[PDB]
Design a protein around this ligand. Structure first.
Ligand SMILES: CC(=O)N[C@@H]1[C@@H](O)[C@H](O[C@@H]2O[C@H](CO)[C@H](O)[C@H](O[C@H]3O[C@H](CO)[C@H](O)[C@H](O)[C@H]3NC(C)=O)[C@H]2O[C@@H]2O[C@@H](C)[C@@H](O)[C@@H](O)[C@@H]2O)[C@@H](CO)O[C@@H]1O
Ligand SMILES: CC(=O)N[C@@H]1[C@@H](O)[C@H](O[C@@H]2O[C@H](CO)[C@H](O)[C@H](O[C@H]3O[C@H](CO)[C@H](O)[C@H](O)[C@H]3NC(C)=O)[C@H]2O[C@@H]2O[C@@H](C)[C@@H](O)[C@@H](O)[C@@H]2O)[C@@H](CO)O[C@@H]1O
Lengths: 151, 160
């Protein structure tokens, strides 16, 4: 078994195409060197045809994290919400880590050490690009590390 | 499937006991916020990162030796001789692109440990001792380290 590590720098308002796609069994971690909780910010996993397989939106004024999916050029699907943004980052200390495990029929999302949701997929497929949309809750550049070739 | 993420801060000359053990299919990554490749006075001493079993066996010992200009990979049972070394020459070449920081990732593939420095696979190490990793340690020979004085370790477990 030969696995791979790839590292990407993603600016706010930018996208990257992955050198190795993320599929069942694989992991993506996003690292932020800041945490500004004092504004809506999103991290996205996208398929090769531009579907949003997983959209994670942090909304500080509404005080929720929204999880959703959508096909390209079509309406958003059914939202899942987790309340109280700040309580999901307890113990952070000015930095943060967001990890997504692809478990096949679900995505597991972990903020630092805490599992926040087991999201049942509304669209299936392989992740081939990542994007970061925002004055952000995270640093202007976030680093993404993928671990692929695991299964 | 419920996987887990755990984060540890390891000072030079210290060790941690893991809350979730690392076994086949799992990952450990070490992060350093410095990389000291200097040659003269202030050059680093030999520095190692270790994966240990519950009885203190060294399942994987990774020794960075700047003056000898090798990375040594080995194992050993508690209080016994070291087993057969595997060596990779030219330390600085394994960190090209780093820019003052470094990531070291170990995948446990069951029969082998795969070791990756940043994005580059440096060895597929055939295990000489098998078992579960239950603690990590960081040794700089009580002197100057090649890495930052605190190294962060992240484990990903419950994968398979
Ligand atoms: C209670 C309820 O059902 N509210 C619904 C809103 O939550 C919903 O808002 C949209 O939600 C999407 C996830 O389900 C997604 O977060 C939308 O924003 C993203 O996508 C936009 C394109 O559609 C655009 O690219 C945004 O920039 C991006 N957001 C980020 C942070 O990347 C979100 O729609 C946006 O935000 C809301 C808050 C509102 O201002 C919209 O005008 C804006 O487009 C809407 C569905 O549109 O339905 C319910 O109201
Ligand atoms: C060419 C050849 O075969 N050289 C061999 C040396 O490489 C070997 O040195 C030991 O190698 C070990 C891995 O195979 C390991 O790195 C030893 O150092 C670690 O373990 C020590 C206890 O045995 C002690 O705890 C050290 O602090 C620790 N080092 C680190 C950085 O964690 C290493 O032995 C040490 O270093 C060598 C270079 C020498 O000074 C030894 O006196 C010293 O203990 C030796 C012994 O197996 O055999 C060949 O010479």
């Amino acid at each position: 078994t030969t696995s791979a590590v790839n590292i990407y720098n993603i600016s706010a308002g930018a996208s990257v195409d992955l050198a190795a796609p993320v599929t069942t069994g694989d992991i993506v971690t996003f690292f932020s060197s800041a945490l500004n909780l004092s504004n809506n910010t999103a991290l996205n996993l996208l398929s090769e045809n531009g579907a949003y397989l997983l959209h994670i939106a942090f909304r500080l004024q509404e005080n929720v994290i929204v999880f959703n999916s959508r096909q390209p050029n079509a309406p958003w699907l059914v939202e899942q919400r987790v309340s109280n943004v700040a309580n999901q980052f307890i113990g952070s200390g000015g930095k943060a880590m967001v990890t997504v495990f692809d478990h096949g029929d679900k995505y597991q999302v972990v903020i630092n050490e805490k599992t926040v949701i087991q999201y049942t997929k509304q669209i299936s497929g392989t992740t081939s690009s990542l994007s970061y949309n925002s004055t952000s809750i995270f640093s202007t550049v976030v680093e993404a590390v993928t671990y692929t070739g695991l299964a």
